[PDB]
Design an enzyme around this catalytic site. Structure first.
Site, PDB file in Angstrom:
ATOM      1  N   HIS A 162      51.114 107.409  32.939  1.00  0.00           N
ATOM      2  CA  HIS A 162      50.664 105.991  32.552  1.00  0.00           C
ATOM      3  C   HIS A 162      51.285 105.516  30.819  1.00  0.00           C
ATOM      4  O   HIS A 162      51.645 104.782  31.043  1.00  0.00           O
ATOM      5  CB  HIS A 162      49.168 105.569  32.501  1.00  0.00           C
ATOM      6  CG  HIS A 162      48.973 105.831  31.514  1.00  0.00           C
ATOM      7  ND1 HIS A 162      48.535 107.420  31.256  1.00  0.00           N
ATOM      8  CD2 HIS A 162      47.568 105.473  31.068  1.00  0.00           C
ATOM      9  CE1 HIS A 162      47.836 107.504  30.479  1.00  0.00           C
ATOM     10  NE2 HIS A 162      47.362 106.537  29.917  1.00  0.00           N
ATOM     11  N   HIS A 163      51.735 106.965  30.129  1.00  0.00           N
ATOM     12  CA  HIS A 163      52.528 106.450  28.844  1.00  0.00           C
ATOM     13  C   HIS A 163      54.357 106.952  29.127  1.00  0.00           C
ATOM     14  O   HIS A 163      54.724 106.177  28.191  1.00  0.00           O
ATOM     15  CB  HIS A 163      52.367 107.768  28.084  1.00  0.00           C
ATOM     16  CG  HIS A 163      50.978 107.563  27.673  1.00  0.00           C
ATOM     17  ND1 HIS A 163      50.265 106.570  27.187  1.00  0.00           N
ATOM     18  CD2 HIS A 163      49.902 108.812  27.674  1.00  0.00           C
ATOM     19  CE1 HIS A 163      49.137 106.277  26.667  1.00  0.00           C
ATOM     20  NE2 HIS A 163      48.735 107.806  27.140  1.00  0.00           N
ATOM     21  N   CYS A 164      54.855 106.922  30.500  1.00  0.00           N
ATOM     22  CA  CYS A 164      56.035 107.880  30.825  1.00  0.00           C
ATOM     23  C   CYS A 164      56.601 105.168  30.783  1.00  0.00           C
ATOM     24  O   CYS A 164      56.600 104.795  31.451  1.00  0.00           O
ATOM     25  CB  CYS A 164      56.243 107.777  31.921  1.00  0.00           C
ATOM     26  SG  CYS A 164      57.733 108.066  32.309  1.00  0.00           S
ATOM     27  N   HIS A 165      56.971 105.696  29.844  1.00  0.00           N
ATOM     28  CA  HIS A 165      58.322 104.379  29.637  1.00  0.00           C
ATOM     29  C   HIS A 165      59.629 104.115  30.663  1.00  0.00           C
ATOM     30  O   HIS A 165      59.608 105.204  31.842  1.00  0.00           O
ATOM     31  CB  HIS A 165      58.881 103.932  28.410  1.00  0.00           C
ATOM     32  CG  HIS A 165      57.659 103.711  27.005  1.00  0.00           C
ATOM     33  ND1 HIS A 165      56.651 104.565  27.062  1.00  0.00           N
ATOM     34  CD2 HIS A 165      58.154 102.698  26.982  1.00  0.00           C
ATOM     35  CE1 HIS A 165      55.962 103.705  26.141  1.00  0.00           C
ATOM     36  NE2 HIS A 165      56.612 102.818  25.528  1.00  0.00           N
ATOM     37  N   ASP A 205      50.932 102.275  27.801  1.00  0.00           N
ATOM     38  CA  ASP A 205      51.803 101.011  27.064  1.00  0.00           C
ATOM     39  C   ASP A 205      52.998 101.725  28.506  1.00  0.00           C
ATOM     40  O   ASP A 205      53.916 100.482  28.275  1.00  0.00           O
ATOM     41  CB  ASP A 205      52.671 101.936  25.953  1.00  0.00           C
ATOM     42  CG  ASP A 205      52.271 103.339  25.575  1.00  0.00           C
ATOM     43  OD1 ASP A 205      51.899 104.212  26.501  1.00  0.00           O
ATOM     44  OD2 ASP A 205      53.318 103.643  24.460  1.00  0.00           O
TER      45      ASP A 205
END
Ligand SMILES: [Zn+2]
Ligand SMILES: [Zn+2]
Lengths: 453, 453
Positions: A162-165, A205
């Site tokens: 869930h933090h990998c853009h 994010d």
């Protein structure tokens, strides 16, 4: 039998996910313990799985993805991340070992080397994680006979997503697991609308950043293109994704004192059904009593389900007004680092919350998705938080009641004993716990190569 | 008398605000009518004022700022906007007339010349508007005897303020009226905490932008300075401001089809008591029946007061734990362009909403601010929307009940007749309306120079 296989929830084990491990062998063994995203998390998640299966032996099916791989070039990666990040990821991994034996940091100097690592083994790990994700989606959609198809699956994968853009890794996330699952489900099963329910302590994010890409807005990583109008927008394509998060606004990626305007804004975004966006972010509140937390849940956190409900009602209307087939899915970003048991901001959740939240996700999926629910493991770092959280999450995934004592310090402490690599056994709670530990430690044989030895 | 003067609400008239007028005399007289921010808005606001005073002759006090001026160099401007924007504003105005007689646009080519104008007369207009703002603040704080001091004031000023950013004008706003009022109230009366309640149809992106500056984050306009840490943050100073908006997310500054990522994010920000920010944005919903709108109000729009209530409770705690004197103020950004009567997105509000909303603002100010309420006119453009909106707003500012017929199409249409520059008179509703029109047209003598002739 009596309970049919289709009535059971699928638990997907990911043996390749064990291979991704912090590689810098020249650090203090104390700094080394600072690195929380590690293979041992899967041993703890197996303890939670084992606990749920021991309480309810007839309600779950264990499935291993074994050696099934997905390609970092597969369409459900390329269409989530572009082609530049996947290829750069593969390059970094292929040069890592040579750098690492010279005592060099293996990631680019523009990254926070403290919150992200990789090695040559990371590639096989990610390929296998993708395989386990495909297995989860397949488990609840694939087959000739809808009646003989399970509705719910939990996928025990790492590293988290869930933090990998769109084009940029961070927070120990090299790949956005949730959007890869969504794209696979759209490509393979024509899932058109997905809500992501994220109860990790941290704002997702990366998952949200990719929601902006799916709305048609230009990602920061991509060079400006004539594909976008004067407002940096283009047409939003299927699948449509809605992102619904509760998280601590004073924690990473917006830790109090260490936070940028831009990340604070994204972690506070609330907007429905406009500009091709569906994003709702809610902030954890301090509580002390059981009744204080229940008020927070009923008056603040439950609204995520209301917004997600609005999302599906709107989607069904747009599809039927346009003569298109609607097909929904509920995805849970199941992170357990908000647990009362997570290692030491006082906004926590009681273990029972994971049962309650998941039960409300079941109601949402029954009403709009024919019950289809896909849970993917995210954050959660101490043995106690992962074990207790997975346990209560799985209990709620099969719509059972949590019993407060099941998550008592005594019980969780006895189970977690089985995570020590050289665990040996030694009264009712102890006997039950060793039954849980024996199954948990045997559940993936690769535990022995990666941990016990 | 019977009703004491301190029990009356002050209405501040701003005769200098009439002087700011669209100046490009070479455009089509049809394009010229496209320009909605114009001096005639004050004539319509005077009709609303007149209506309230005719219904309740004992409840209001009219006060003219006359020739009172504030400096564009005053501390309550410099500390809101910096020194670069004020000086650039004065330069533009001083070169405008020469440009304008050559058929040249008077603003910089990087601005949307269609949504912003100025002339040499703009300077005196802004100086007078600042004077009227000071008058409003003084009206409710100044004097030796607290018992003999009014609690509520409405300030009929233009041009509006809520689109003016820290260093950048837009949306017909050259100066952020609300933050200038706040800074004056802090400098002169030691007001420490202010909530801004904004019910304009449009997001107050300028008011919110300056809230970010007050939190200590670097404005986009300012060159990066060693004053800020590695996260672009520094210490947040008094006064503390909380911004609470309901607005149409598909309208300007984020009109559907014509909207940037960055403006969508700001118009959707919800965050309390973190990173020195207090910002809450809520989006208008479509409705059809009276009961549909009441549900929206009770379940969606009223939450602005709950969040503002939380703001004041938190502020009182921080002040008393630290041995500092707390002093609150409620500021209303009173814009009437969401009115059912505004010129033709179907998210509107009924005229009665302005009474209801203002009455709830009274309750908030009674509980936390000793009743101190300052309303500043913002948007609202048709004669019908401004007149009906000001009327119901003032009725609620004095805690009276709205009567549905008071805002009927028949009544508002009869009053608005008096806005035509050459109005002549001609049954009960007509007699009352001409009584309202006579007072409204006489209320600022400068109407005659600027409009009637
Ligand atoms: Zn996390
Ligand atoms: Zn406006």
């Amino acid at each position: 039998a009596q309970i049919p296989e289709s009535a059971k929830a699928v638990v997907v084990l990911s043996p390749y996910s064990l291979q991704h491990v912090f590689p810098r062998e020249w650090v203090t063994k104390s700094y080394r313990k600072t690195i929380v995203e590690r293979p041992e998390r899967l041993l703890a998640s197996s303890m939670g799985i084992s606990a749920a299966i021991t309480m309810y032996p007839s309600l779950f099916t264990l499935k291993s993805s074994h050696q099934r791989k997905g390609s970092l070039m597969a369409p459900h990666v390329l269409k989530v991340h572009g082609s530049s990040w996947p290829a750069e990821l593969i390059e970094l991994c292929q040069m890592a070992d040579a750098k690492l034996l010279k005592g060099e940091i293996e990631v680019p100097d523009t990254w926070n080397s403290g919150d992200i690592y990789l090695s040559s083994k990371t590639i096989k790990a990610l390929q296998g994680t993708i395989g386990a994700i495909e297995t989860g989606v397949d488990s609840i959609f694939k087959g000739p006979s809808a009646e003989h198809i399970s509705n719910r699956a939990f996928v025990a994968i790492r590293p988290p997503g869930h933090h990998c853009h769109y084009g940029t890794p961070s927070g120990f996330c090299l790949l956005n697991n949730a959007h890869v699952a969504i794209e696979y489900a759209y490509d393979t099963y024509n899932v058109t609308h997905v809500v992501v329910l994220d109860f990790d302590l941290h704002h997702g994010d990366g998952t949200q950043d990719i929601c902006w890409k799916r709305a048609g807005f230009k990602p920061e990583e991509e060079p400006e293109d004539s594909s976008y109008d004067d407002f940096g927008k283009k047409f939003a394509e299927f699948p449509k994704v809605g992102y619904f998060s509760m998280h601590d606004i004073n924690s990473f990626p917006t830790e109090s004192g260490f936070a940028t305007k831009e990340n604070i804004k994204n972690a506070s975004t609330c907007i429905m059904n406009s500009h091709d966006l569906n994003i709702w972010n809610i902030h954890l509140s301090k509580w002390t009593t059981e009744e204080e937390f229940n008020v927070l849940y009923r008056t603040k956190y439950r609204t995520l389900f209301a917004k997600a409900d609005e999302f599906f009602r709107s989607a069904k209307l747009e599809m039927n007004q346009q003569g298109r087939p609607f097909k929904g899915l509920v995805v849970i970003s199941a992170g357990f680092d908000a647990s009362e048991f997570e290692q030491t901001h006082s906004v926590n959740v009681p273990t029972s919350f994971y049962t309650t939240f998941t039960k409300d996700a079941l109601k949402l999926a029954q009403m709009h998705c024919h019950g289809k629910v896909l849970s993917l493991m995210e954050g959660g770092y101490s043995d106690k938080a992962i074990c207790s959280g997975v346990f209560a999450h799985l209990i709620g995934l099969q719509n059972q009641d949590w019993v407060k004592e099941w998550g008592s310090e005594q019980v969780v402490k006895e189970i977690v004993r089985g995570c020590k690599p050289a665990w040996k056994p030694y009264d009712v709670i102890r006997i039950w716990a060793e039954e849980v530990i024996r199954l948990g430690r045997a559940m993936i044989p690769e535990f022995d190569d990666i941990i016990f030895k």
